[PDB]
Design a protein around this ligand. Structure first.
Ligand SMILES: *[C@@H]1O[C@H](CO)[C@@H](O)[C@H](O)[C@H]1NC(C)=O
Ligand SMILES: *[C@@H]1O[C@H](CO)[C@@H](O)[C@H](O)[C@H]1NC(C)=O
Ligand SMILES: *[C@@H]1O[C@H](CO)[C@@H](O)[C@H](O)[C@H]1NC(C)=O
Ligand SMILES: *[C@@H]1O[C@H](CO)[C@@H](O)[C@H](O)[C@H]1NC(C)=O
Ligand SMILES: *[C@@H]1O[C@H](CO)[C@@H](O)[C@H](O)[C@H]1NC(C)=O
Lengths: 277, 363, 43, 130, 50
């Protein structure tokens, strides 16, 4: 049916319009060379979300903590030596330096033996370094916005069953499409759960993705890329660029035995091979 | 390089597994060998007959010595006028590999100029002297005044009847100075990203280059033919014709040792090399999204079902399996910057303990 | 306009360091504080 | 660089007066609690504006519960406007421009280079229409 | 850690994410394909229309 019904039954000559290329279409007609990288991809709602502030391992990396304990032991030993030169701050000098990491501890009366004020000044200068380093660490965290992908790719564990996970979702394709045949040649259960999750129109599926009437949608990659490039608000930054997908191209379908193959192929290679494409 | 050394060795990889898949699908036998030179093949003037000829893989194919070229076939308009092609297996473009990976003490005391520390030291010395003179003319006293003058600066009290305004202005001064230092250190380490790239083919600085923009391509490759047909590349051709290299590893070792500065190459191969060598970042503008297929002869019974097997590999996840073999297969720190901070801290601690030895030995 | 695109370039458009003027003005406020402290000290 | 003048008058011109208003209100509350129920008469201004910064200035332990509530509220307020001050320093850093040295063909430099301490220089190509 | 994260977050709000929200590039095809609210106009009977 359609353009395939026109070309195979020879009422037309060639399919200049946009058409996917797969096995049985290459059986029934002879395509031209491909010229544009048009795979498949998935468009979802993909809202704002957060920036995921999980943790931080930049200053210490579980090894500067040894330097902190060594400096605590050195400060405690020198405090023991000062108080031996001059009866409750044996292990409490550790707490004295250790509460003044964040400079809001209970003020212990500092000795006038000139040593403790020097080491507190050195530790306070080090505090001036590391609170600035923490502000630098969060400043190196807010460089560019991000949003985690709920689906890694076509081999997702969420694609097994959405009842396995606590939020269930839904995925759709186009009716009577070549993507349906690509799924049915690859996954029967994907088609089975897609059958109850059908839709009609491309802009209709776009509104269903915007208004929350549909969670996921599977279509050709570059068409969704152009729709994201003209998106109202540009809130659709898709998962990658079609890396875990079919990754095919578009061409011109000619009749089996047409002499127009080589000339149109050379013309396509001329149109690509000069920057005019 | 070598006068005569042609041996049987082991070959594996991506296209080898592609040939294994072709032998698994179809019904034939084969024999694997290599090409003599390291060139693709260019329509180049030979000295006799005033006629341009070929060499390399195309030269061995047109001579009949080759039966099927399995290679990264740069599918172009030139080679299609002479032989027939197949449908492409790889979608892969072109990009520019450069060296913008410039690592870094973060300018605490020693790389930076010493105005701030000497200024704060002389300022707090003047403050302590005038506070002790106001303590003399009040409306270990010197040691207490100096230690309080440090402690206002320390951020972690003598008689101040006419001196509390001085102390509060000095405290606000100390905090606004350390806040400005925090603000502009974070500001310098956030905006430390200048322009170091080329931004694709539309770079007029490389349309008329200099002795620093050292860019080239593979010697006698299809990229040079694609640039030679186009008229806006000729000056770049006049830059590239004197520094063309044989293999891509020559370009890797050249730009790694900064013999080059930019290199036009296929995208995913440079992505794999960036996964291997972490000091390789390509440019952003992707240009000439091309296709790699199989070099084939003319009208032959191994044209239809071979391309059907290629499309059968496209429809299933075998291309994803080949990506799993090689494409998906990838690879305030305070250890270099704040290490000298810890060294100066330890040196100041040792010098302070020595001054405490001198102070105990005096009194 | 095509020739202006061909024969011109437009990538060039229109550096962190301690300002000297900011703590200079803070030093002017500081000198005013010294003046007020001297006025309150002499009387 | 951009070479700014200062960071007090172009930033805090209408805020500084209300900060003094809240300072006098909190000091009046402190004096009223000190007279209602040892040096919280005149030294409380120095104490309160030292609680703005907290640069290791030991003052006293306030026995008044109202004084401790005002210390807590003033400390939280000091933390949040210190955060806003750092945010405003970042916001002033965000823009990037360059101040032009000569802003006119009738410049005072163009009269004589003895007007300024470095003797500058400028020339032309000969036989030009310029 | 909480109040320093709060300070750096309030420093991060005023950092200009979304620098420009419109179609100021003349060769952007939203000029070629307008919408219900992309309203661009010109002077009636001027040289710009010609
Ligand atoms: C799709 O095919 C079915 C076959 O019965 C039928 O509903 C119709 O021909 C097509 N409908 C749409 C939505 O294209
Ligand atoms: C497939 O290859 C083998 C190799 O010996 C050959 O003998 C066999 O006839 C081939 N199969 C068919 C059905 O052609
Ligand atoms: C020059 O001409 C001869 C003519 O047979 C040709 O075979 C040869 O390749 C050329 N020179 C070289 C490269 O030896
Ligand atoms: C190609 O495959 C078809 C079956 O799909 C087979 O009938 C035909 O003989 C094959 N041709 C050759 C020679 O590869
Ligand atoms: C201007 O032109 C005249 C005539 O060629 C020549 O003599 C003179 O040197 C030129 N001026 C200079 C200084 O270049």
């Amino acid at each position: 049916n359609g353009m395939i019904g026109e070309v195979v039954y020879q009422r037309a000559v060639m399919a200049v319009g946009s058409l996917t290329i797969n096995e049985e279409r290459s059986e029934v007609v002879d395509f031209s060379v491909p010229f544009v990288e048009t795979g498949i991809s998935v468009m979802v709602s993909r809202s704002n979300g957060t920036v995921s502030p999980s943790a931080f391992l930049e200053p210490f990396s579980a090894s500067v903590w040894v330097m902190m304990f060594v400096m605590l032991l050195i400060v405690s030993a020198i405090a023991v030596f000062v108080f031996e030169y001059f009866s409750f701050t044996i292990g409490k000098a550790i707490w004295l330096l250790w509460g003044l990491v964040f400079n809001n501890s209970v003020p212990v009366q500092n000795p006038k033996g000139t040593t403790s004020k020097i080491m507190v000044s050195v530790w306070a200068f080090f505090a001036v370094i590391f609170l600035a380093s923490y502000t630098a660490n969060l400043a190196a965290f807010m460089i560019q916005e991000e949003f985690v992908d709920q689906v890694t790719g076509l081999s997702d564990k969420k694609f097994q069953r959405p009842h396995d996970y606590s939020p269930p979702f839904r995925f759709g394709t186009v009716p009577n499409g070549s993507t349906e045949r690509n799924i049915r040649n690859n996954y029967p259960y994907m088609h089975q759960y897609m059958t109850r999750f059908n839709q009609r129109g491309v802009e209709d599926a776009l509104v269903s993705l915007k208004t929350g009437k549909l969670d996921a949608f599977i279509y050709d990659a570059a068409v969704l890329n152009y729709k994201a490039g003209r998106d109202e608000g540009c809130k659709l930054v898709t998962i990658g660029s079609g890396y875990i997908f079919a990754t095919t191209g578009y061409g011109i379908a000619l009749q089996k035995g047409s002499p127009w193959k080589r000339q149109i192929d050379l013309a396509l290679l001329q149109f690509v091979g000069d920057g005019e494409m | 390089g070598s006068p005569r050394h042609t041996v049987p060795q082991c070959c594996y990889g991506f296209c080898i597994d592609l040939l294994i898949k072709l032998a698994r699908t179809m019904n034939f036998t084969y024999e694997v060998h290599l090409v003599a030179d390291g060139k693709f093949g260019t329509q180049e003037r030979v000295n006799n007959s005033n006629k341009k000829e070929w060499n390399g893989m195309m030269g061995e194919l047109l001579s009949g010595q080759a039966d099927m070229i399995v290679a990264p076939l740069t599918i172009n308009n030139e080679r299609a006028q002479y032989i027939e092609f197949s449908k492409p297996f790889k979608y892969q473009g072109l990009t520019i590999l450069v060296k913008k990976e410039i690592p870094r003490l973060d300018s605490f005391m020693q790389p930076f100029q010493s105005t701030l520390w000497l200024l704060v030291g002389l300022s707090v010395h003047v403050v302590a002297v005038m506070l002790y003179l106001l303590d003399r003319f009040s409306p270990l006293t010197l040691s207490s005044a100096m230690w309080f003058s440090w402690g206002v600066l320390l951020n972690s009290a003598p008689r101040s009847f006419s001196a509390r305004i001085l102390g509060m202005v000095w405290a606000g001064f100390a905090m606004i100075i350390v806040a400005s230092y925090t603000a502009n250190l974070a500001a310098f380490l956030v905006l430390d990203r200048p322009e170091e790239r080329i931004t694709g083919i539309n770079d007029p600085r490389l349309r008329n280059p200099s002795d620093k923009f050292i860019y080239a391509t593979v010697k006698q490759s299809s990229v040079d033919i694609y640039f030679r047909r186009q008229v806006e590349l000729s000056t770049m051709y006049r830059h590239m014709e004197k520094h063309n290299y044989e293999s891509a590893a020559e370009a890797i070792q050249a730009v790694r040792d900064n013999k080059l500065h930019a290199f036009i190459w296929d995208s995913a191969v440079l992505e794999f090399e960036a996964s291997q060598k972490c000091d390789l970042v390509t440019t952003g503008e992707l240009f000439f999204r091309s296709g790699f297929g199989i070099g084939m002869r003319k009208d032959s019974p191994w044209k239809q079902n071979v391309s059907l097997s290629i499309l059968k590999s496209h429809e299933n996840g075998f291309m994803e399996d080949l990506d799993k073999t090689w494409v998906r297969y990838q690879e305030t720190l305070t250890f270099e910057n704040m290490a000298g901070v810890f060294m100066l801290v330890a040196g100041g601690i040792v010098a302070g303990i020595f001054l405490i030895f001198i102070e105990i030995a005096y009194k | 306009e095509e020739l202006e695109t061909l024969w011109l370039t437009g990538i060039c458009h229109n550096s962190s360091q301690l300002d000297i003027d900011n703590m200079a003005g803070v030093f002017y406020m500081l000198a005013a504080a010294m003046a007020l402290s001297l006025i309150t000290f002499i009387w």
